[PDB]
Design an enzyme around this catalytic site. Structure first.
Site, PDB file in Angstrom:
ATOM      1  N   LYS A 135     -11.215  26.351  21.225  1.00  0.00           N
ATOM      2  CA  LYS A 135     -11.571  27.787  21.543  1.00  0.00           C
ATOM      3  C   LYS A 135     -10.027  27.407  22.452  1.00  0.00           C
ATOM      4  O   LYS A 135     -10.173  26.885  23.290  1.00  0.00           O
ATOM      5  CB  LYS A 135     -12.613  27.697  22.105  1.00  0.00           C
ATOM      6  CG  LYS A 135     -13.859  28.669  21.140  1.00  0.00           C
ATOM      7  CD  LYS A 135     -14.904  29.426  22.235  1.00  0.00           C
ATOM      8  CE  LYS A 135     -15.700  30.199  21.290  1.00  0.00           C
ATOM      9  NZ  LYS A 135     -16.709  30.689  21.501  1.00  0.00           N
ATOM     10  N   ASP A 158       4.351  25.522  27.707  1.00  0.00           N
ATOM     11  CA  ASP A 158       3.120  25.052  28.114  1.00  0.00           C
ATOM     12  C   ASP A 158       3.168  23.425  27.057  1.00  0.00           C
ATOM     13  O   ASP A 158       1.817  22.983  26.067  1.00  0.00           O
ATOM     14  CB  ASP A 158       2.002  25.742  27.681  1.00  0.00           C
ATOM     15  CG  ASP A 158       0.091  25.998  27.591  1.00  0.00           C
ATOM     16  OD1 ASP A 158       0.235  24.529  29.006  1.00  0.00           O
ATOM     17  OD2 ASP A 158      -0.929  25.690  26.970  1.00  0.00           O
TER      18      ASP A 158
END
Ligand SMILES: COc1ccc2c3ccnc(C)c3n(CCCC(N)=O)c2c1
EC number: 2.7.11.23
Length: 347
Positions: free
Chosen positions: A33, A153
């Site tokens: 997730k 990221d």
């Protein structure tokens, strides 16, 4: 009721194991997730292989950003070079129950799961070298002028092993990525791996990924984040502990310089004053990377004492490369092409 019952209150698709989508994909289980959405393990009945499907959140802002990830993935995949095989392969995409779904090749677990498996002892310097060379090659691929892609990221979680028992890796989660011309966010990168130029609110280029890489590589060998900041102010101070005050020519141009620093009458910069004689950080530049790595004391925490491939010469090379990756100045921070020529990688 969210999306006629298919979604939860966080715009995520309610994953149901054993569900079959479009008489093709058989949903096995949820892998992970994230802010973007969920990644699930699924079997592709048509191609007769296992795939990973990223189910983007059912929300305009997330959909629109995922469309950029798709554009970038397809652009990278089309290029013909062996370097492109360090980026995860996007097989196809489709809309399903109002969720954008991205079908990826199946991979193994990520470098954080790898660190956790060692009880955060860290991986060997030889394995770190293998990851470093691959990552520098990947960043060299992203730097090709036609692409000029900034991942934005990089972190252990976004670097995955291709096979659980092999050192081959691939980069994932390009959702926050952008091209050199089209930069649309200010607050980017995961805090531990955020570059000083982003912390200072300055314009950024591909150099920010090299900064993250430096942080990652040290964490891979030591087992803990180099700059583990609880917030931006804590993050900047932890960087200053190791690298000192950033150069004046940078702070003089930094919009957020006064969030962390103050300019003295003589034109020099110092950290903002702290009230009531409170001491929370080591003086600027006194937390030496020489000691963090245990260059002359047998590696991080002495855990590598008397081990092959952990010679002082090896550590001094590793340290030099890291410090060139952690250059405050993005103009002089080592670039992928030249990092790959570093003595740390010599055969
Ligand atoms: C396992 O194979 C895979 C294969 C591809 C991906 C992929 C592609 C794009 N974005 C993300 C976040 C991706 N993940 C996230 C895993 C998270 C985790 N802990 O494993 C993947 C995983």
């Amino acid at each position: 009721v969210y999306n006629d019952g298919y979604d939860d209150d966080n715009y995520d698709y309610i994953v149901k194991n054993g569900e079959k989508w479009m008489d093709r994909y058989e949903i096995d289980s949820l892998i992970g997730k994230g802010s973007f959405g969920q990644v699930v393990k699924a079997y592709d009945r048509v191609e007769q292989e296992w795939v990973a499907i990223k189910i983007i959140k059912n929300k305009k802002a997330f959909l629109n950003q995922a469309q950029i990830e798709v554009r970038l993935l397809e652009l990278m995949n089309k290029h013909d070079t062996e370097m492109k095989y360090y980026i995860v392969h996007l097989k196809r995409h489709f809309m399903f129950r109002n969720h954008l779904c991205l079908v990826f090749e199946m991979l193994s677990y990520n470098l954080y799961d790898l660190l956790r498996n060692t009880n955060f002892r860290g991986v060997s310097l030889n394995l770190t070298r293998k990851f470093a060379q691959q990552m520098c090659t990947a960043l060299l691929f992203l730097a090709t002028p036609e692409l000029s892609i900034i991942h934005c990221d990089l972190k252990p979680e976004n670097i995955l092993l291709c096979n659980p028992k092999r050192s081959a890796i691939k980069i994932v989660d390009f959702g926050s990525s952008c091209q050199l011309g089209q930069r649309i966010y200010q607050y980017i990168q995961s805090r531990f791996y955020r570059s000083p130029e982003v912390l200072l609110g300055m314009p950024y280029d591909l150099a920010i990924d090299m900064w993250s890489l430096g942080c990652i590589l040290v964490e891979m060998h030591t087992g803990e984040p180099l700059f583990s900041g609880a917030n931006e102010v804590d993050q900047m101070n932890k960087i200053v502990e190791v690298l000192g005050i950033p150069p004046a020519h940078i702070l003089d141009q930094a919009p957020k310089a006064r969030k962390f620093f103050e300019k003295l009458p003589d034109g020099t910069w110092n950290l903002k004053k702290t009230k009531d004689g409170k001491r929370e950080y080591k003086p600027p530049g006194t937390r030496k990377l020489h000691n963090i790595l245990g260059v002359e004391t047998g590696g991080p925490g002495g855990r590598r004492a008397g081990e092959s491939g952990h010679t002082v010469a090896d550590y001094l090379k590793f340290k030099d490369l890291i410090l060139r990756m952690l250059d405050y100045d993005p103009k002089t921070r080592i670039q992928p092409y030249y990092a790959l020529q570093h003595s740390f990688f010599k055969k």
